[PDB]
Write a protein that binds this DNA or RNA. Structure first.
Ligand SMILES: Cc1cn([C@H]2C[C@H](O)[C@@H](COP(=O)(O)OP(=O)(O)OP(=O)(O)O)O2)c(=O)[nH]c1=O
Ligand SMILES: [Mg+2]
Length: 428
DNA sequence: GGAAGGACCC
DNA sequence: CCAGGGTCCTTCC
């Protein structure tokens, strides 16, 4: 019921939030304006000469469409909520969510029927579901359950690659090979007369999920596909405790990618969705048809991206676990406009940043402060030394200054902060 | 390589 | 009266 989309829009109307949200949107239509206008200044010649480019490239892309790997994307269901429910029977049959009055990280599925969703403000969620119990996050409790599950996964692909605590990719192609020759008792599990799983990628995933539930009590969903991109889209097709596969042939990819909302693809945000919708693009088939216009309107990197999606292409090799490019700490709070205090709230952030930094014994050389007006407007000043910071005082050194400069930049005006934060980056 | 501003993911 | 952790992509010296 859109009584939801009303209670929300209603409880947002005058907020300084909707305020900046409007300014945000006005700036997107401008980016779009600068596009349609940019478009109009294109001639059939340029355009056709382009169709030639893209069509060739695509022709190559197409010759190297790898369909040998059986990638699997696994996604825990309502992770934080689910976990908090498991640790506390009290919440058993009640609707919950994990967050604060100002922000929910998720809502179990019962709460979802009421319109409550992740990233929705708490006070609003309480508007749609007064009976909503809101549990504070407990990440360590999550990393835990996440390690517990990563254990079950190592079995099918010791080199899996975790995207976030509740998601992961798996190249079960090798497992499937050895599994074709596995005695039924090597795929028989006892429930806690029981069950035995087949040899299909369909079945191994069916097993992987089974194990995960049996072990942590939480259900998960999975997508089975020829490559990364398709898999993550599939893991949501039946999302609550289900799975969906896309067979290893090109038509299968095609039949799925056809009519598939461009926005369901990972990387296409609410913003580029609106820009492509401007050009008349909603699905992947529409997106493909426009492979010409796109090469003239977007970065080589973007339309390159756009082309793979339109053709159902994507990673097929799970790269090694990269490295940490940065580490930050930031807090929101009831307005703080007093300078003495802001220098204090900062000392804290720096001190915290310093300790989470010691846990990984990391040392970077670039510190960025981050400030957010009472109007959500956001500044962000960097500063890179050449000695390699580490300690709390060291960081708070660059930071303190970085901050001073922005206070002064307001000469007699005090910075009306709602948010402040610190990020150290540039490690070895 | 930096410094600013953003889009997107969870 | 709208979070917080991270990564990657332009845009200017
Ligand atoms: C989206 C989103 C997720 N998360 C957290 C909440 C989730 O427990 C966790 C996983 O992301 P999601 O997978 O998108 O959330 P979910 O798994 O709980 O729900 P679903 O069953 O639809 O997959 O990360 C955030 O903290 N902030 C966010 O903005
Ligand atoms: Mg999930």
């Amino acid at each position: 019921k859109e009584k939801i989309n009303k209670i929300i829009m209603e409880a947002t109307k005058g907020s300084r939030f909707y305020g900046n949200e409007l300014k945000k949107e006005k700036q997107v239509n401008q980016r779009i304006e600068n596009m349609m206008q940019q478009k109009a200044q294109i001639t059939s010649q340029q355009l056709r000469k382009a169709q030639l480019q893209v069509d060739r490239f695509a022709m190559e892309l197409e010759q190297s469409r790898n369909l040998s790997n059986t990638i699997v994307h696994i996604d825990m269901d309502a992770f934080y909520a689910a976990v908090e429910m498991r640790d506390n029977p009290e919440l058993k049959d009640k609707p919950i969510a994990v967050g604060s009055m100002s922000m929910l990280s998720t809502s179990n599925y019962h709460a979802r029927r009421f319109g409550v969703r992740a990233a929705m403000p708490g006070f609003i969620a309480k508007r749609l579901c007064p009976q909503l119990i809101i549990v504070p996050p407990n990440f360590d409790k999550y990393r835990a359950v996440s390690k517990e599950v990563k254990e079950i996964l190592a079995d099918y692909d010791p080199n899996f690659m975790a995207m976030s605590l509740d998601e992961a990719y798996l190249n079960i192609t090798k497992h499937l090979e050895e599994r074709q020759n596995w005695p039924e008792d090597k795929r028989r599990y006892f429930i806690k007369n029981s069950v035995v799983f087949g040899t299909s990628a369909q079945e191994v995933v069916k097993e992987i999920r089974f194990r995960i539930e049996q072990k942590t009590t939480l259900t998960a969903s999975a997508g089975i596909a020829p490559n990364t991109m398709l898999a993550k889209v599939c893991s949501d097709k039946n999302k609550p405790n289900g799975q969906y596969q896309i067979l290893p042939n090109r038509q299968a990819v095609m039949d799925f990618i056809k009519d598939l909302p461009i926005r369901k693809v990972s990387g296409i945000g609410k913003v580029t969705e609106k820009m492509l919708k401007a050009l008349g693009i909603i699905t992947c088939t529409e997106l493909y048809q426009q492979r010409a216009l796109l090469s003239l309107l977007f970065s080589e990197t973007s339309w390159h991206y756009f082309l793979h999606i339109s053709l159902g292409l994507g990673s097929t090799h799970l790269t090694r676990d990269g490295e940490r490019k940065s580490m930050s700490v930031e807090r929101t709070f009831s307005e703080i406009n007093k300078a003495e205090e802001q220098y204090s709230l900062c000392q804290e952030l720096c001190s915290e940043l310093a300790q989470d930094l010691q846990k990984e014994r990391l040392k970077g050389r670039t510190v960025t402060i981050k400030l957010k007006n009472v109007n959500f407007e956001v500044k962000t000043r960097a500063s890179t030394v050449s000695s390699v910071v580490s300690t709390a005082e060291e960081i708070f050194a660059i930071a303190k200054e970085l901050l001073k400069t922005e206070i002064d930049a307001d000469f007699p005006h005090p910075l009306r902060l709602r948010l402040m934060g610190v990020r150290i980056s540039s490690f070895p």
